Amino acid sequence: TKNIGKGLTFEDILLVPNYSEVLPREVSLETKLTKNVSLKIPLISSAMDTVTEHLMAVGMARLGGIGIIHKNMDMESQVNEVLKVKNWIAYSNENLDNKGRLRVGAAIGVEIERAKLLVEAGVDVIVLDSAHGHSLNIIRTLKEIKSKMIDVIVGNVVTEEATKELIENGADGIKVGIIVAGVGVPQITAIEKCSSVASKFGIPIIADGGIRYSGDIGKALAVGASSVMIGSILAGTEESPGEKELIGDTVYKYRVKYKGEMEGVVYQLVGGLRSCMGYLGSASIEELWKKSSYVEITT
Amino acid sequence: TKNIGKGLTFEDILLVPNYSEVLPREVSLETKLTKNVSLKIPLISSAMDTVTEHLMAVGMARLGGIGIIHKNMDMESQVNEVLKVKNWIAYSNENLDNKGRLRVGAAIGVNIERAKLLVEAGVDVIVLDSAHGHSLNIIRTLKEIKSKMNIDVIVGNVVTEEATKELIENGADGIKVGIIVAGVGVPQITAIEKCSSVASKFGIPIIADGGIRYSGDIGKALAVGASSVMIGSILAGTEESPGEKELIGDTVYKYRVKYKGEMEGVVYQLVGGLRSCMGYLGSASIEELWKKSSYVEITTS
Amino acid sequence: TKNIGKGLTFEDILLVPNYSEVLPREVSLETKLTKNVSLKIPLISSAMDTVTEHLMAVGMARLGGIGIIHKNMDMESQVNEVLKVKNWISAYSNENLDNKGRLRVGAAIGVNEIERAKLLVEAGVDVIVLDSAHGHSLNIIRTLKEIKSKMNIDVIVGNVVTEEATKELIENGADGIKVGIIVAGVGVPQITAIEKCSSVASKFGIPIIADGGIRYSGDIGKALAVGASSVMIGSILAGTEESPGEKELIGDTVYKYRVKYKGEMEGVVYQLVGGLRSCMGYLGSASIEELWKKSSYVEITTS
Amino acid sequence: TKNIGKGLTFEDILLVPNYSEVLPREVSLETKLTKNVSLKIPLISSAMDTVTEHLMAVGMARLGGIGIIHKNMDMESQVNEVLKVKNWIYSNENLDNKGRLRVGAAIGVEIERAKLLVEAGVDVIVLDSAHGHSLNIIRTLKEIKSKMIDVIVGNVVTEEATKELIENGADGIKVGIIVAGVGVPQITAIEKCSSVASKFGIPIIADGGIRYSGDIGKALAVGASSVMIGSILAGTEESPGEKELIGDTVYKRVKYKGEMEGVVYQLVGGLRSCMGYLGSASIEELWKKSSYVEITTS
């Protein structure tokens, strides 16, 4: 039988409320990014050219999490970007290094030299982003990094096989999230399948792609995820790459729509995670894996 | 496994007709609001500032149901709004207290000073509402009322069976059931089912709150264990609702919400739907409905 | 558990092709309306005031099937519409004729109208149809008992949906049974209905009629295939010429006095019969009999 | 018990990513059409009067494919459309063992026609029909084999039918069946048909219901050897109509689509990628290592 079974997305389920003693405020947002790296809030900016560059990795680490930079630039620009973040001259929170600064990241395309001048410039994590992680060309760029430079997050997968197979070769964290090619696995039943294995092993999960509203990210961590990757919903903000076009009745980031000051967006999303964790009586993300429960919504 | 069951809404089900002797007009719609407070029809008007103040709660009571004055005001104000109802010194299907005056209820917020004055005011039932009802703060405001005061108490919003066990065990006389930014909820039919597992065993009546678009839903609620439904947005711009009238684009608005005319037309229609459902299901009472009700699973179409 | 299963309607199903050796044109479309009465095409026009009166009851019985005069009128004038159809004296080829060789008519009654029945039978009516919104009632069983014990005749159920309902109804003497039922929140999807009602309809020679849920030619195929012997079309014969009303042009489309226009009903019946033929051909069935025997279907997830 | 389970279509399932040894730009699209005709891409153009004449069968077989000339013209008219293909006077061509491009022709219950098209030297005769598992379709298929060729039989979905048709004569099996009220959702239909016919090297052809490049991926993955594309090629320059502009957009009646190489290259790149994710070097590879999951409309 080629038919595995019913695969669920965020729109497919709602979360069941539990006995609660914790208020929205009290809740602990701290959690692990890799093993040796950790995030104060469980949100990390996406490795998309239209979203995450400079002022972004700023707002990302000073508000609690990390920010990942893309592979679509000449070396010295990803090197002169990471080094522009770590360097600085009532923003409370603030995620820092061990030599106490800021936090950043980078994308690696399957190459090894870009991973070199990155790690040397002092990069906290580097991600092996690839439209299909479970391979030979990627399974290998692992060992070709482990035995030279660092905590590595390997690119996107959706299978239980693709996660045992990956962590063995030293996968220090996993990105899950795979019309045209006709391939995919709905996001919930992915994380449900990928952390069913990424545990026992101390290896966290990053839910990449599909994040529309606050009550989405709740379900992600609830299911296994240790963090969540935020792309399109930050796409056109002020602190991202684009210029500005004023053309009547509307304003764009040059082509994409302007989504204002980024802080607000990360505030309204954190606020959602807070209200979610309240309802569910999870005091902290580790508690949300123990005390979850969800029902299926036949729309 | 995290996936428990599949959850169901009113829209997911259609009730199944059984053998029937009794006519839509000959059915009794008496139910219970709490162990000590009855109703003549199973409709309660929400504790929303767009729905119920005084003139609304009086409309409700005179028709069998009751109103629950919202808490979105001063303590002084709310004590006066319950009074105006207590002192209404025909209307044959009216709901009176053991003292011969119209019944009324009032909403209350987590953590008592408001409670006291309302129980002092003559309010009949106290509704302690919350986004999340199975919490420690809410249980704490429940036993810390039942010791200082003696009034009947309806509690919070709850969707799980664990939650309705504890609230009863702590002295709730009724419990209501109803829970995108959230990401949290169990659907109404599956919620009303689970909460009745526990409640219909202690004789404690359930109130079905929110999710009520039209007549069909009111029947479908009570059939799956609810003792009464609570109506809200359906009564939003009605003459007895709090706002003031005003004309904009050749249509009448309130305060903004689109005005719905006289309330009684709304509540007669709804009752007419319920009477009609218990006819198809051969039920001359609500406790009859609980015993002989059936439903099927609908996929859109 | 109050969950008694899933409820499937027409658009949840698709009929599965079988080994075939009959073409559309080759097929038998003959069936039973009751034990005693029978139809040449399995189509009843409704008993709504907007579709079946004398003029509509004729084009149905000419083309093979039948029509049931709506009850929304006085006693004597319904008798007149009845005796108007039993009297068509001046190709037909498919005409449904009785024992005297006149056109076939059925008529509708309700509540406990015992006197309307007496008047209709003696006027020559072939069936009486006892409608209630809910037919599994003590008031419909009291009326069935009393019509069947007295005025001979063939009586139709009313409106049932469960199997206990059709069972209880045949016990008291129902010759034909009728299946079909937001303001109330009640109902059972039409496929799931005809199946369970048909699970009890056979075992006795009692045929089942499909009332409601009928939009397209292909919902007729789906209904008879699951058990029905007859389907009752009505919604879609409302604007036709032969239904009561008044051609009355407003704006740029012709209406009725209140529904939109549909032209000649012959054109619809011929469209529906011809689509049934195409279906029966895919299922490799030369009758409804054979259809029931070899039918099969799968569930569609719409998209 | 009547109902025989939930049937699935392309939109209900997504494919599940496997262990991947292979690349996109490096897979053997190659496959089988009939027990003995091979194709360089698994796409065959349909026999609709509004899709496949000569200029199109050419476009197909030139790109690795093949095209079935329709039965909507007198015997003569059609036979000349075949002649124009078995007679061209870039690489990756699909040619028969004598160095001439490959053509199919359709027929449906019609010996006299069938012999002629064979005589004009056609590769495949296609016994197309509404309901394929009929009597008049067995007898037509039989009489044809006992008087000459290659034969495909016309749209079945039930597994029984894929058997009574192979059992006596069939070389390939085409799968695909509002007013109608009949059919089996496409994925379930291929699947049901493959399981009862993959045994013999008899290829199943996925006929119709196709939309985006993904669908081709899905359709083979489950068991089909080749997928036929119909309404996606309809209004391209190499099809039947004539070009004329009426208000903004150009038509043929149906909206214009442009060169057909572009409809195919894009469709070629979708199978490239699909197989890349499901890490199969070949099509026969894929029918051994293919998992899928269900989606709901939400």
PDB file of N, CA and C in Angstrom, chain A residues 71 106-116 119 126-130 132-155 165-166 169-172:
ATOM      1  N   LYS A  71      22.064  32.785   1.149  1.00  0.00           N
ATOM      2  CA  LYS A  71      23.191  32.397   0.297  1.00  0.00           C
ATOM      3  C   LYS A  71      23.244  33.132  -1.073  1.00  0.00           C
ATOM      4  N   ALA A 106      23.751  31.933   9.072  1.00  0.00           N
ATOM      5  CA  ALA A 106      24.007  31.977   7.637  1.00  0.00           C
ATOM      6  C   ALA A 106      23.523  30.721   6.937  1.00  0.00           C
ATOM      7  N   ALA A 107      23.187  30.864   5.655  1.00  0.00           N
ATOM      8  CA  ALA A 107      22.798  29.730   4.830  1.00  0.00           C
ATOM      9  C   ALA A 107      23.949  29.230   3.967  1.00  0.00           C
ATOM     10  N   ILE A 108      24.070  27.910   3.883  1.00  0.00           N
ATOM     11  CA  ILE A 108      25.112  27.241   3.102  1.00  0.00           C
ATOM     12  C   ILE A 108      24.446  26.461   1.965  1.00  0.00           C
ATOM     13  N   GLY A 109      24.887  26.714   0.735  1.00  0.00           N
ATOM     14  CA  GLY A 109      24.431  25.946  -0.421  1.00  0.00           C
ATOM     15  C   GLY A 109      25.425  24.884  -0.873  1.00  0.00           C
ATOM     16  N   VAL A 110      24.925  23.647  -1.006  1.00  0.00           N
ATOM     17  CA  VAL A 110      25.692  22.493  -1.498  1.00  0.00           C
ATOM     18  C   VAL A 110      26.039  22.673  -2.969  1.00  0.00           C
ATOM     19  N   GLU A 111      29.186  23.564  -1.743  1.00  0.00           N
ATOM     20  CA  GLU A 111      30.259  24.480  -1.374  1.00  0.00           C
ATOM     21  C   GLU A 111      30.677  24.282   0.079  1.00  0.00           C
ATOM     22  N   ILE A 112      31.884  24.664   0.433  1.00  0.00           N
ATOM     23  CA  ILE A 112      32.440  24.546   1.804  1.00  0.00           C
ATOM     24  C   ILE A 112      33.220  25.805   2.223  1.00  0.00           C
ATOM     25  N   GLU A 113      33.588  26.649   1.250  1.00  0.00           N
ATOM     26  CA  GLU A 113      34.392  27.845   1.471  1.00  0.00           C
ATOM     27  C   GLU A 113      33.581  28.936   2.161  1.00  0.00           C
ATOM     28  N   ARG A 114      32.281  29.031   1.862  1.00  0.00           N
ATOM     29  CA  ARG A 114      31.368  29.999   2.458  1.00  0.00           C
ATOM     30  C   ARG A 114      31.096  29.670   3.922  1.00  0.00           C
ATOM     31  N   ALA A 115      31.154  28.370   4.232  1.00  0.00           N
ATOM     32  CA  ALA A 115      31.095  27.876   5.606  1.00  0.00           C
ATOM     33  C   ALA A 115      32.382  28.201   6.378  1.00  0.00           C
ATOM     34  N   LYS A 116      33.496  28.310   5.660  1.00  0.00           N
ATOM     35  CA  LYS A 116      34.780  28.630   6.271  1.00  0.00           C
ATOM     36  C   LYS A 116      34.818  30.079   6.748  1.00  0.00           C
ATOM     37  N   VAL A 119      32.301  30.802   9.756  1.00  0.00           N
ATOM     38  CA  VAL A 119      32.714  30.315  11.082  1.00  0.00           C
ATOM     39  C   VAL A 119      33.869  31.149  11.667  1.00  0.00           C
ATOM     40  N   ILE A 126      25.265  27.906  11.345  1.00  0.00           N
ATOM     41  CA  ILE A 126      25.100  27.930   9.897  1.00  0.00           C
ATOM     42  C   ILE A 126      24.206  26.789   9.424  1.00  0.00           C
ATOM     43  N   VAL A 127      23.240  27.117   8.552  1.00  0.00           N
ATOM     44  CA  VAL A 127      22.167  26.199   8.154  1.00  0.00           C
ATOM     45  C   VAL A 127      22.366  25.628   6.747  1.00  0.00           C
ATOM     46  N   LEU A 128      22.266  24.309   6.633  1.00  0.00           N
ATOM     47  CA  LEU A 128      22.369  23.653   5.343  1.00  0.00           C
ATOM     48  C   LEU A 128      21.035  23.631   4.611  1.00  0.00           C
ATOM     49  N   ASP A 129      20.488  24.800   4.255  1.00  0.00           N
ATOM     50  CA  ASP A 129      19.190  24.914   3.601  1.00  0.00           C
ATOM     51  C   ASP A 129      19.235  24.343   2.185  1.00  0.00           C
ATOM     52  N   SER A 130      18.287  23.429   1.910  1.00  0.00           N
ATOM     53  CA  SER A 130      18.190  22.716   0.639  1.00  0.00           C
ATOM     54  C   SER A 130      16.766  22.211   0.478  1.00  0.00           C
ATOM     55  N   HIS A 132      15.653  19.656  -0.394  1.00  0.00           N
ATOM     56  CA  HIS A 132      15.565  18.216  -0.044  1.00  0.00           C
ATOM     57  C   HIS A 132      16.821  17.737   0.703  1.00  0.00           C
ATOM     58  N   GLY A 133      16.729  17.654   2.035  1.00  0.00           N
ATOM     59  CA  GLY A 133      17.867  17.294   2.894  1.00  0.00           C
ATOM     60  C   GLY A 133      18.381  15.859   2.818  1.00  0.00           C
ATOM     61  N   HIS A 134      17.458  14.906   2.721  1.00  0.00           N
ATOM     62  CA  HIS A 134      17.765  13.474   2.789  1.00  0.00           C
ATOM     63  C   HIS A 134      18.396  12.935   1.496  1.00  0.00           C
ATOM     64  N   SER A 135      19.702  13.153   1.352  1.00  0.00           N
ATOM     65  CA  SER A 135      20.411  12.797   0.115  1.00  0.00           C
ATOM     66  C   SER A 135      21.856  12.261   0.316  1.00  0.00           C
ATOM     67  N   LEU A 136      22.679  12.373  -0.729  1.00  0.00           N
ATOM     68  CA  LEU A 136      24.108  12.057  -0.681  1.00  0.00           C
ATOM     69  C   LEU A 136      24.917  13.357  -0.720  1.00  0.00           C
ATOM     70  N   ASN A 137      24.495  14.293  -1.560  1.00  0.00           N
ATOM     71  CA  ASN A 137      25.209  15.570  -1.680  1.00  0.00           C
ATOM     72  C   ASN A 137      25.129  16.420  -0.399  1.00  0.00           C
ATOM     73  N   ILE A 138      24.151  16.101   0.448  1.00  0.00           N
ATOM     74  CA  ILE A 138      23.880  16.894   1.643  1.00  0.00           C
ATOM     75  C   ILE A 138      24.313  16.096   2.879  1.00  0.00           C
ATOM     76  N   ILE A 139      23.988  14.802   2.883  1.00  0.00           N
ATOM     77  CA  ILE A 139      24.486  13.865   3.894  1.00  0.00           C
ATOM     78  C   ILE A 139      26.010  13.991   4.071  1.00  0.00           C
ATOM     79  N   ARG A 140      26.695  14.514   3.030  1.00  0.00           N
ATOM     80  CA  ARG A 140      28.149  14.545   2.927  1.00  0.00           C
ATOM     81  C   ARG A 140      28.699  15.914   3.314  1.00  0.00           C
ATOM     82  N   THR A 141      28.089  16.969   2.829  1.00  0.00           N
ATOM     83  CA  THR A 141      28.464  18.330   3.202  1.00  0.00           C
ATOM     84  C   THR A 141      28.414  18.465   4.737  1.00  0.00           C
ATOM     85  N   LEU A 142      27.784  17.487   5.394  1.00  0.00           N
ATOM     86  CA  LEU A 142      27.861  17.352   6.853  1.00  0.00           C
ATOM     87  C   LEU A 142      29.286  17.044   7.365  1.00  0.00           C
ATOM     88  N   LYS A 143      29.802  15.847   7.058  1.00  0.00           N
ATOM     89  CA  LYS A 143      31.150  15.405   7.479  1.00  0.00           C
ATOM     90  C   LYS A 143      32.259  16.334   6.953  1.00  0.00           C
ATOM     91  N   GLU A 144      32.055  16.850   5.740  1.00  0.00           N
ATOM     92  CA  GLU A 144      32.938  17.848   5.131  1.00  0.00           C
ATOM     93  C   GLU A 144      32.910  19.223   5.866  1.00  0.00           C
ATOM     94  N   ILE A 145      32.164  19.298   6.976  1.00  0.00           N
ATOM     95  CA  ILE A 145      32.090  20.497   7.832  1.00  0.00           C
ATOM     96  C   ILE A 145      32.412  20.156   9.291  1.00  0.00           C
ATOM     97  N   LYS A 146      31.861  19.034   9.763  1.00  0.00           N
ATOM     98  CA  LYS A 146      32.111  18.522  11.117  1.00  0.00           C
ATOM     99  C   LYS A 146      33.601  18.388  11.396  1.00  0.00           C
ATOM    100  N   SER A 147      34.313  17.782  10.445  1.00  0.00           N
ATOM    101  CA  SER A 147      35.762  17.604  10.537  1.00  0.00           C
ATOM    102  C   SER A 147      36.562  18.742   9.867  1.00  0.00           C
ATOM    103  N   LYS A 148      36.138  19.991  10.079  1.00  0.00           N
ATOM    104  CA  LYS A 148      36.946  21.169   9.726  1.00  0.00           C
ATOM    105  C   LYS A 148      36.622  22.358  10.642  1.00  0.00           C
ATOM    106  N   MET A 149      35.422  22.931  10.508  1.00  0.00           N
ATOM    107  CA  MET A 149      35.033  24.100  11.285  1.00  0.00           C
ATOM    108  C   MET A 149      34.459  23.698  12.638  1.00  0.00           C
ATOM    109  N   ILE A 150      31.600  23.211  14.920  1.00  0.00           N
ATOM    110  CA  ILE A 150      30.444  24.105  14.804  1.00  0.00           C
ATOM    111  C   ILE A 150      29.102  23.354  14.687  1.00  0.00           C
ATOM    112  N   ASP A 151      28.135  23.793  15.496  1.00  0.00           N
ATOM    113  CA  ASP A 151      26.742  23.357  15.396  1.00  0.00           C
ATOM    114  C   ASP A 151      26.126  23.622  14.010  1.00  0.00           C
ATOM    115  N   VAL A 152      25.727  22.541  13.338  1.00  0.00           N
ATOM    116  CA  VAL A 152      25.070  22.610  12.027  1.00  0.00           C
ATOM    117  C   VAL A 152      23.593  22.164  12.080  1.00  0.00           C
ATOM    118  N   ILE A 153      22.718  23.012  11.534  1.00  0.00           N
ATOM    119  CA  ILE A 153      21.333  22.646  11.214  1.00  0.00           C
ATOM    120  C   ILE A 153      21.267  22.268   9.730  1.00  0.00           C
ATOM    121  N   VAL A 154      20.912  21.021   9.446  1.00  0.00           N
ATOM    122  CA  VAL A 154      20.771  20.563   8.064  1.00  0.00           C
ATOM    123  C   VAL A 154      19.403  21.012   7.531  1.00  0.00           C
ATOM    124  N   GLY A 155      19.310  21.195   6.210  1.00  0.00           N
ATOM    125  CA  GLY A 155      18.103  21.710   5.540  1.00  0.00           C
ATOM    126  C   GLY A 155      16.872  20.834   5.638  1.00  0.00           C
ATOM    127  N   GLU A 165      18.897   8.981   9.980  1.00  0.00           N
ATOM    128  CA  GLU A 165      19.947   9.092   8.963  1.00  0.00           C
ATOM    129  C   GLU A 165      20.773  10.399   9.029  1.00  0.00           C
ATOM    130  N   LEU A 166      20.142  11.499   9.424  1.00  0.00           N
ATOM    131  CA  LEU A 166      20.843  12.776   9.481  1.00  0.00           C
ATOM    132  C   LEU A 166      21.626  13.038  10.763  1.00  0.00           C
ATOM    133  N   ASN A 169      25.148  11.343  11.342  1.00  0.00           N
ATOM    134  CA  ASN A 169      26.248  12.102  10.743  1.00  0.00           C
ATOM    135  C   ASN A 169      26.409  13.485  11.375  1.00  0.00           C
ATOM    136  N   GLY A 170      25.859  13.642  12.573  1.00  0.00           N
ATOM    137  CA  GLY A 170      26.044  14.854  13.351  1.00  0.00           C
ATOM    138  C   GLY A 170      25.130  15.993  12.951  1.00  0.00           C
ATOM    139  N   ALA A 171      23.830  15.713  12.857  1.00  0.00           N
ATOM    140  CA  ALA A 171      22.846  16.767  12.604  1.00  0.00           C
ATOM    141  C   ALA A 171      22.514  17.478  13.916  1.00  0.00           C
ATOM    142  N   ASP A 172      22.970  18.722  14.069  1.00  0.00           N
ATOM    143  CA  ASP A 172      22.772  19.457  15.330  1.00  0.00           C
ATOM    144  C   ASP A 172      21.519  20.359  15.320  1.00  0.00           C
TER     145      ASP A 172
END
